[PDB]
Amino acid sequence: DPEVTLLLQCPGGGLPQEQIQAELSPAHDRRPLPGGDEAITAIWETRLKAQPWLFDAPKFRLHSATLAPIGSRGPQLLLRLGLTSYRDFLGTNWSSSAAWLRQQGATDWGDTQAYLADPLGVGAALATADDFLVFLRRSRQVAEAPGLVDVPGGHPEPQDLAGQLVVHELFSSVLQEICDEVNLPLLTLSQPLLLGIARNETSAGRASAEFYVQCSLTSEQVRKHYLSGGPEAHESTGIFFVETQNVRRLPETEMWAELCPSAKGAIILYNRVQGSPTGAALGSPALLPPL
Template sequence: MDPEVSLLLQCPPGGLPEEQVRAELSPAYDRRPLPGGDKAITAVWESRLQAQPWLFDAPKFRLHSATLVPTGSLGPQLHLCLGLTSYRDFLGTNWASSAAWLRQQGATDWGDKQAYLADPLGVGAALATADDFLVFLRRSGQVAEAPGLVDVPGGHPEPQALCPGGRPLHINLPGELVVHELFSSVLQEICDEVNLPLLTLSQPLLLGIACNETSAGRASAEFYVQCSLTSEQVRKHYTSGGPEAHESTGIIFVESQV
C-alpha cells in the first residue's frame, strides 16, 4: 500500500449499499478552535487566493469517526459521526505548514491528533468500464490539492446541496439525506469530471474509508461504480469535455486484475 495512504475502515466484501450506512450530525464532531485562535487559517486562505484566485470556499462534512456495527440479518451497517467544516479551513489546517504540529497538539490537548484539523470527508470512485478497465485522471495544475498527480474521479459531498439558499446547520441535516448526498455525490463527480451520462453508472458500493497522510490524514470514502460503457466510449465522452474538465488534463485506463 502507498505509505501516504492508510486504511481507516474496510467494509465487508462486496461493499455496502446506501441502505446500510447511517450518519449522525452534531457540533460535537466539528474541529476544535485552534490554540490562539483561527487567524492563521485566514492568513493561509488569503495567501492561497492570491496565488489561485479561482478558489472558492464552501461548507463540507467533517468526518469525526466511522464504526461498523453488526445488525443481524440486515448485515453490517456503517455508522458515520459527522460535523461541519469548510474548504477554507481545510487549506488552513490539513494543508498548512503547521499541520504536523496541529496533529501533535491535538493528541496532547484532546487525545485526538485530528482534533484541530478540518478533515473534510472526500469521495473517490473505483470506476470500472464494461471491458474491465479502471479509470484514472491526471489532475490539472489549477487544483489546490495534488496538482499534476494521477487520481481516481472524486471530490466532496456538499452540505449546501441539502440547504439550497441557506447556511447548512447540523440540526437541518437529517442523517438519511446526508448519506444520500454522500452516495449521489460520487456519481455526480464522475458525471462532471469524466463527462459520463448518469444512466451509464451503477449504484455505488462503499468499499471503505482511506486517509491521505499527504493532507494530514484527511479521510475519503471510496466507492466501486460500474459503467456500462467501454473504455473507448468513456474516452470519447471525456475528450468532448464536461462541467469540470478544467480539473484534469488526461484520462488513463488500467486493466483490472480480476
Template sequence: MDPDISIMFQSPSSRGLSEDRVRVELSPRYNRRPLPQYEARIAESWSQRCQQNPWLFNGSKFRIHSASLEREESGEEEGGEGRQERGVLLRLRLGLTCYRDFMGTNWAPWAAVLQQRGLGELGDSQAYLAEPLGVGAMLLTADDSFVFLKRSERVGEAPGKIDIPGGHPEPKAVAVGIPEESIQLKDLSEELVVQELFFSVLAEIRDEVNLPLHSLHKPILLGIARNNTSAGRASAEFYIRCSLTSEEVKHFYWEGGPEAQESTNIVFIKREDVLRLEENALLWSELCPSAKGAVKLYSLVQPV
C-alpha cells in the first residue's frame, strides 16, 4: 500500500454502512492528552501560521480515538430463547479537539516525537495528537464518473493537489446556539453527532461543488483512512451517488459555491479507471493522501 495512507477501518460489506448502522460514544477520555512542555509550541506555531495565512481560522472539531465493529442484538425472542442478532454496527469513540491543535500536533515538525512518546508512555501513538476526524466523498455521477477537485494553492493542506470533496463534521452544527470556543461534550447528543457525520459530507459537496442537495443520494460509509503525511490523521470516506451527469455537475461547479475558493478546477475520472488508479503512477502521485485513502477504500469495498 502507498506509504502515504493506511486503513483504520473498512466496511465488512460491499453495501457499506448506512447511517443507521453507526453509533457514536462521546467521552473526555477520548480527548487529546496534553503535554505541558508542548502547549506553548502549539500556540506559537498557530500564531505564526495565522500571520502567514490570514484566512486561516480555528474551530472545534471531533477527535477520533478508535472505531470497532459490534453486533446489534434484538430483545428477547418469544419463549425467552436467547437473543437474536440483527446486524453489524460501527461504534466511533469521539472526543473534542480543534484545528489549531491539529496544526500544532499532527501537522507539526515534532509530530513523530509525539507519536513515539505516546506509544512508549501510553501504548497509543496518537494519544498526544489532535486527530480531528475528516470526511470525504467518492461522488459518482449519473454517467459513471467520479468527481475530483484540484485544490487551490492557498489552502492550508495539500495545496495544488487533486482531492475529493470533503471537510469536517462540525460540533457547532450539533451544539446550536453555543459559542464554538465554549462547546463541551456535555452539550452534544450522540445521535445528532451521527447525523452530522453523514450530513456534513453532503454539505461539503454542496459548498465545494455547488450541487443541490436533492441531487445527492444518501451517503454510504466505506471506511476510515489515515493520512500518514499528517501523522495518521483520520477521515471517514463515503460513497455517494449523484443524479446529475458530468456535464451538469461541471455547470454547477463553474457557477461557484460558498467554498469555491478552495479549488481551481474539477476533474472527472471514469469508474473503471478509478479502480485501476494506483497503476497510473503519474495521476496517483497528483492525488493528496485523503483522496488516495478514499480511492483505496472504494476499490476494496466496491459498493454496488
C-alpha cells in the first residue's frame, strides 16, 4: 500500500496516556521555505479571495517519535512536537510543488519533511460491545478524499511539564471527535490506547496518531445514536460496521480500495497491535484460522 507507511508500532497492545512524554519546542517547527514564506502568503491570499469565510487555525506538528527499549520501566515513548497552521498546510503538503519541497529538504536538512507543515491528525479503531469496528462514509463534496470510507478522528488544535498537557489534549481530542461525529455519550467510551503512528504519502507524508477505543454500546445502539443526530449532527453521509473477525483480512476485500489512507493506517495498526495473538490460547488453530 504505497499511500501509507508506518512510522511507529506501539508495544504491549498499545500505550496509555501515562506512559507518553511530549517535548513541545520551536526547534520542532517547519524550516522557512528556500525562497521564503511569501509563497505560503500568496496561496493563502488567493484562497481567501475565492472563499473569504475561511479562517486559519493552529495545529500540532510531528517532528519525530522515539520508542524506549521494549519491556523497560518508565515512559515508553517521547513525541517531539512543534506548531503549524491550516495556512502553512495549504501552502506546503497540499501545494502542487510538495514533491519538490520534500527533495530540497533531503538536500538542505537531510529531512524530506523539513519544509512541510505536517499537522498531526488523530484517528480511532472504535470497537462496539458486540465486537464490530465503526466506519463512516465521506461526503462527495469535500476536498480531501471525497466519497471514501473513514474512521472517526480529526486534527486537534492547541490551547514534559507543558508536554503532559499536550499528551492529555491529544487523548482528549480522539474522544471529543467520537462524541461530535458519532454522537455517542463520553461515558460509553474507554480511555484511549495509542496503537502507533501512520504517514499519508498522498498528502506528502503527514502523520496521524492512531488509537484504540472500546464503547459499551452494541453496533445497533451506536447506529441509533449516530442517525438520531440528523444530517446536521455529522459531516459524514453514513455509518456502517465490520466484525473484528472480518477486519483481519480487510486488505483482501473490495472495501480496501475505498478506504482513505489514514483509515488504512488505523486498520493496519489495529491488526498488528490489538489483533495478532502471541499466546498459545488465542494462537490455537480453531481460534486463529490459517490463511
